[PDB]
DNA sequence: GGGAAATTCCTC
DNA sequence: GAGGAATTTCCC
């Protein structure tokens, strides 16, 4: 479950 | 269509 | 172990 680098979704 | 903000990943 | 750097998304 590795999530990439980015701003959370709305 | 461009600019600004948040979280996450890697190094020493 | 703690800190710095990189990438992605939303609004007007």
Swiss-Prot record:
Subcellular location: Nucleus; Chromosome
Source species, domain of life: Eukaryota
Post-translational modification comment from the UniProt entry: Constitutively phosphorylated on two or three sites. Hyperphosphorylated at early stages of apoptosis, followed by dephosphorylation and methylation, which coincides with chromatin condensation. Isoforms HMG-I and HMG-Y can be phosphorylated by HIPK2. HMG-Y is not methylated.
DNA-binding positions: 1-10
Protein family per UniProt: Belongs to the HMGA family.
Disease link: A chromosomal aberration involving HMGA1 is found in pulmonary chondroid hamartoma. Translocation t(6;14)(p21;q23-24) with RAD51B.
Oligomeric form and interacting partners: Interacts with HIPK2.
Function statement: HMG-I/Y bind preferentially to the minor groove of A+T rich regions in double-stranded DNA. It is suggested that these proteins could function in nucleosome phasing and in the 3'-end processing of mRNA transcripts. They are also involved in the transcription regulation of genes containing, or in close proximity to A+T-rich regions.
Name assigned to this protein: High mobility group protein HMG-I/HMG-Y
Native source species: Homo sapiens
Lineage: Eukaryota, Metazoa, Chordata, Craniata, Vertebrata
Originating gene: HMGA1
Full-length numbering of the shown residues: 80 to 89 of 107
